[PDB]
Every structure is written in structure tokens, then in C-alpha cells.
Write a protein that binds this ligand. Structure first.
Ligand SMILES: *[C@@H]1O[C@H](CO)[C@@H](O[C@@H]2O[C@H](CO)[C@@H](O)[C@H](O)[C@H]2NC(C)=O)[C@H](O)[C@H]1NC(C)=O
Ligand SMILES: *[C@@H]1O[C@H](CO)[C@@H](O[C@@H]2O[C@H](CO)[C@@H](O)[C@H](O)[C@H]2NC(C)=O)[C@H](O)[C@H]1NC(C)=O
Lengths: 49, 314, 97, 52, 49
């Protein structure tokens, strides 16, 4: 039986980060634009989009 | 030593994570959020991992009757006799260590873990997990017999010693907060509260940076500035529900308790069947007490195998 | 292939190379949330354990008792064994006595 | 949760128990096309009715 | 016959004799133990009912 390792997501405020390939089994990485993460205190970054 | 077995846990701290459904069909940021459930043991003793640790007091010291948990920016404390785990009825907590609860549970669909707040409130996190164990052997009994056979089967021990497997831990990120901003006529005031605070603002020029005291900036608005706690000298579990800090580098590893061990565990002998003879045939009367597996084959050239799950008398 | 036996394979227990094919498709996070969603076909090993079939233990012909570690079959009754023997002269008795 | 009988109980002034029980076959099926048990953290929103 | 109707028979309710055939078998007690293990076919009357 396998296990799926997922690390904590990366969030960048007012910036774009591209991710590069790696030599791991079934490595899958993606980048998404226009996100407004929330937390238990409030907003995370100024940049709305 | 047992207290010396906690040498690692001096470097960690509880955290707050997102329960999608946390008691009343509502999403909440709970301090007892469930992360993963492991059920590799054949006996069927579930191991549960959740945000709050057990065995450390808020002063970071050994105590077996006390639980430390995250609340706001602080670490509050609760009693251990207020811990409940349940699938459908009430469950039995066999052991517990830090980030892990080792329990045994009846069949059900959902799993709920709840503790008591310092204000005598109840905090619960509950998820979906199809649990339905079948004991080793060829019979699905429910309670050990007082006469039977011993079969090898695998369980989780209570030893806290070093184990091969490990859990990664990293540096906690900045925690946004808004209750650290106040208005004074035409200026904004931020309070340190005893922790380093990072601020960004757009009013004027050169109003960005970090502080350890109560600052006041003139001609600014509440909705125009961001403040966040920044110190975070402790460690935190890497969880997919808390954003990762700027540094993409792993910070450390911590051993997990309760390894997997091979023990002997008990099964009952089925009742002998009733045999009726015949001309090159036999008739078997089967009187089961539990669902039992019945198989037969012939010792010739080509065998006529058969096997089935007998439940009622046949 | 994903979902069946052999979803992940390794040449030996201690090998450092692993081949996996399980359809790890990622999805966009929901607005106003901090999480990572993913859809993955369940482990093929558990499925195979669920409906493996019938073992050779309860099917082998000729009453062949199957055991493991090492893999072997015992009390398999088939054929005949030729025996060649060389006897000393001290195991017989003379005609006179 | 799913069941067959519904019972409502209170306590009394003298610390007695007063409960009454009726029969009600209750098994609720969530809206949509999936027979789930607990809410997920990533899914779809569907119109649905409750008590305010 | 054991397991079926009429495994225990009596001429009347008040009769002092009884005919029983239920395949009672005793087993050797487990080591380090004090008990009495027995195997016996379930009551035929309940099966008939
Ligand atoms: C502080 O906040 C300001 C805006 O509130 C950020 O400035 C933005 O920076 C991005 C990229 O650097 C630009 O695309 C925007 O146009 C900027 N906004 C403005 C109003 O100028 C700034 O990056 C933040 N700095 C920190 C350290 O958080
Ligand atoms: C159950 O018993 C078996 C038999 O000893 C254990 O299997 C061995 O484990 C050791 C680990 O130190 C290996 O070096 C051997 O190669 C294993 N033997 C075989 C035949 O595979 C097994 O570890 C026990 N179960 C548990 C949970 O420890």
C-alpha cells in the first residue's frame, strides 16, 4: 500500500512563482493565480488578485 | 527516562487547523483537527493524529494528566479526563502520546474526537472514516473466547522508545491578526502585546517594517494597514491546511510512538458438524454461531473445489 | 495500471527506486480557503486483498498441502519412485542354518 | 442519527427522570446524488432547505 | 437425532425419565487454567421453531 505525501502549500503575495520538475515518483506540481487565502485572524495579503 | 523521552517535545507547539464539520454541521478553525488515521494493525487498534498534543503542560514539562492546546496566539491547558473519542457509541482509549491517540472502536462510518476547553466548553472535530474490522482467522467473532487457539496477529505497543518512522516539522509562518489595530482621531495605533509584529501600510512613504512596541502612525486608516505576528521561535507540523513559510527547506524530524509488533491473539474453535453417511456422498449439518467459512475439495485428478460463508444453520 | 494489482512496484524491499502510476490529478483550491485538493484512484493492493479470488491452498490437485517460507508442496501423491540398493553379504542367512 | 424510535427526556424538581418515547422511522438522505455522511472540505454547492 | 426435532424426549410432562442425544463432548483444559470446555450441538427445539 502506498502513501501520498503532500507538503504545506506555498503562497506568495503580489508575486508569481513557477515550479520546476523533480525526480520523484508521480510528482505533480501546479501554480494557481488569483487567490485570497483567509486564516483565523483575517486576510493574508493585501494584493486582492 | 520517561520524562527524558520528551526531550524532543520541548521544541514543538500545538496549532489551529480547519475542521470542515466540527459538531453542528459548520466549518470551524478547531484546535483538535484530525489529520490522518492509520489502521495497519490486524487486531484493529486505530491510531489517530490531531493538532493538540497530550503529555506536555503549557510550561513545557512532563505531566500525564494534562493537555496543551493552541488558542489565539497562546497555549492553554486542559484536563485529560475530558477526552472522548467515538465512532457510533463510546470508544476505549488504550494509549496516548503527544500527537497520537491509540484507541479501539466499534463499527461505524464517522469518527469524532472531543476535548474540554478551559472555559468548560466542548471542542470537537469529526470526519468520515469507514471502519469495519474483521478479526484474523476464518470466523467473524466479536468477543474473545475462554477456550480456543492462538494465531499470530499484529498490534500496536505502548513503548515510547525510538522508532524508525518519522514526521517532518517546519517553521511556523506569520499569523494574520486584526485585533491589534485601533483608531485615534486621524491616526492608527498598533500594540505589541509582547510579541514582534510586522506591519505594511500604504499611507505616505516608509511605513513598512517590524516593531516590538506600541507604534502610532498619523493620517492612516484601519483598512489600510496589515499587522501580523512574526516571532515563531518554536516548531510546527507540516500540514496541508496551514500555509508554508518562505523557506522551502525542511527544519527537522520527530519520531512517532507506538510501533507495530507481532503478538499472539485468540480465536475460537467452531462446533463440530453433524455427519450423515451415504452411498458415495456425505450430508453435513452445519450449525454456526458466527459467520464462518466452509470449504471442501476432492483429492483426485481434477478437483471440485468449493467455498462459502455460512451464516445460518444449513 | 491504476486501481488494480501492481499500481506501485519495487524491485526489492530495500530498493531506492519506485515506479508508481495512480493518477494524481490536482484541483484548484476553493475561494477563501487554505488547502490542497487532489483526486487519486484508491490503492490497488487493498482492492486485490478484497477480491483476490481462491488460493491454491484450497484448490491444488492430488491433496497437495501448500506451505510458504519456503514455497513448497507436501504429501503430493503422484507417480512412482525407483529405488536402487546395494546390500552387504552380512545381512543374509545361509541355506544350511 | 438514523434510528427507529424517538425519546424526549427531562429531569424533575426532585431529581426524578421524566421521559416519553414514540416510534418514528427516520433515515434522511442528503440532497444531490451522493449518499455521504460528513461534509467535505472541497466540493459543490447545491440549493437545499432547512429551518431558520 | 441431534440438532433436529425431538433431540430430548419424555413420555409426559411429569415423567421422571428422559432420553437425550445431543453429542456432548469434553475437551482437555488449556494449560495454566481452571475451567471445563465442552462442545454440543444446539437445541433442536429452537431450530425447529
Ligand atoms: C506592502 O503593500 C503594498 C501595497 O499595499 C505592496 O505594494 C505592491 O507591490 C506589488 C508588487 O511588488 C505591486 O504590483 C503593487 O502595485 C504594489 N501596490 C502599491 C499600492 O504600490 C508591497 O509589496 C507590500 N510590501 C510588503 C513587504 O508586504
Ligand atoms: C511477525 O513475525 C515475523 C516472523 O519473524 C516477522 O518477520 C520478520 O521480521 C524481521 C524484522 O526484524 C525480518 O528481518 C525478517 O526477514 C522477517 N521474516 C520474514 C519471513 O519475512 C515480522 O516482523 C513480525 N511482525 C511484526 C509486525 O514485526
Amino acid at each position: 500500500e502506498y502513501k501520498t505525501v503532500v507538503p504545506s502549500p506555498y503562497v506568495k503575495c503580489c508575486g508569481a512563482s513557477e515550479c520546476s520538475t523533480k525526480e520523484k515518483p508521480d510528482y505533480q506540481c501546479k501554480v494557481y493565480t488569483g487567490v485570497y487565502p483567509f486564516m483565523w485572524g483575517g486576510a493574508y495579503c493585501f494584493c486582492d488578485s | 527516562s520517561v520524562s527524558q523521552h520528551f526531550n524532543v517535545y520541548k521544541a514543538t507547539r500545538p496549532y489551529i487547523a480547519y475542521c470542515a464539520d466540527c459538531g453542528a454541521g459548520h466549518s470551524c478553525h478547531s484546535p483538535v483537527a484530525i489529520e490522518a488515521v492509520r489502521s495497519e494493525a490486524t487486531d484493529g487498534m486505530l491510531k489517530i493524529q490531531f493538532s493538540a498534543q497530550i503529555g506536555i503542560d503549557k510550561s513545557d514539562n512532563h505531566d500525564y494528566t494534562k493537555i496543551r492546546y493552541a488558542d489565539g496566539h497562546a497555549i492553554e491547558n486542559a484536563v485529560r479526563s475530558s477526552l472522548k473519542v467515538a465512532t457510533s457509541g463510546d470508544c476505549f482509549v488504550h494509549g496516548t502520546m503527544g500527537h497520537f491517540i491509540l484507541a479501539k472502536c466499534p463499527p461505524g462510518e464517522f469518527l469524532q474526537v472531543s476535548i474540554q476547553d478551559t472555559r468548560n466548553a466542548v471542542r470537537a472535530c469529526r470526519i468520515q472514516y469507514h471502519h469495519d474490522p474483521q478479526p484474523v482467522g476464518r470466523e467473524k467473532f466479536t468477543i474473545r473466547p475462554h477456550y480456543g487457539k492462538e494465531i499470530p496477529c499484529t498490534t500496536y505497543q505502548q513503548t515510547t522508545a525510538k522508532t524508525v518512522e518519522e514526521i517532518d516539522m517546519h517553521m511556523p509562518p506569520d499569523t494574520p491578526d486584526r485585533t491589534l489595530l485601533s483608531q485615534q482621531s486621524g491616526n492608527v495605533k498598533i500594540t505589541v502585546g509582547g510579541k514582534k509584529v510586522k506591519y505594511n501600510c500604504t499611507c505616505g512613504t516608509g511605513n513598512v517594517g517590524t516593531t516590538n512596541s506600541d507604534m502610532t502612525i498619523n493620517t492612516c486608516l484601519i483598512e489600510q494597514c496589515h499587522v501580523s505576528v512574526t516571532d515563531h521561535k518554536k516548531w510546527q507540523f507540516n500540514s496541508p491546511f496551514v500555509p508554508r513559510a518562505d523557506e522551502p527547506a525542511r527544519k527537522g524530524k520527530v519520531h512517532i510512538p507506538f510501533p507495530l509488533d507481532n503478538i499472539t491473539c485468540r480465536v475460537p474453535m467452531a462446533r463440530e458438524p453433524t455427519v450423515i453417511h451415504g452411498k458415495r456422498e456425505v450430508t453435513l449439518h452445519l450449525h454456526p454461531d458466527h459467520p464462518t467459512l466452509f470449504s471442501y475439495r476432492t483429492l483426485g485428478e481434477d478437483p471440485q473445489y468449493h467455498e462459502e460463508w455460512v451464516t445460518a444453520a444449513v | 495500471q491504476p486501481g488494480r494489482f501492481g499500481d506501485i512496484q519495487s524491485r526489492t524491499v530495500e530498493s531506492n527506486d519506485l515506479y508508481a502510476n495512480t493518477a494524481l490529478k490536482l484541483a484548484r483550491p476553493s475561494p477563501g480557503m487554505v488547502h490542497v485538493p487532489y483526486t487519486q484512484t484508491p490503492s490497488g493492493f487493498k482492492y486485490w486483498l478484497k477480491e483476490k479470488g481462491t488460493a491454491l491452498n484450497t484448490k491444488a490437485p492430488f491433496g497437495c498441502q501448500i506451505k510458504t517460507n519456503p514455497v513448497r508442496a507436501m504429501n503430493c501423491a503422484v507417480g512412482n519412485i525407483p529405488v536402487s540398493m546395494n546390500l552387504p553379504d552380512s545381512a543374509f542367512t545361509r541355506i544350511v542354518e
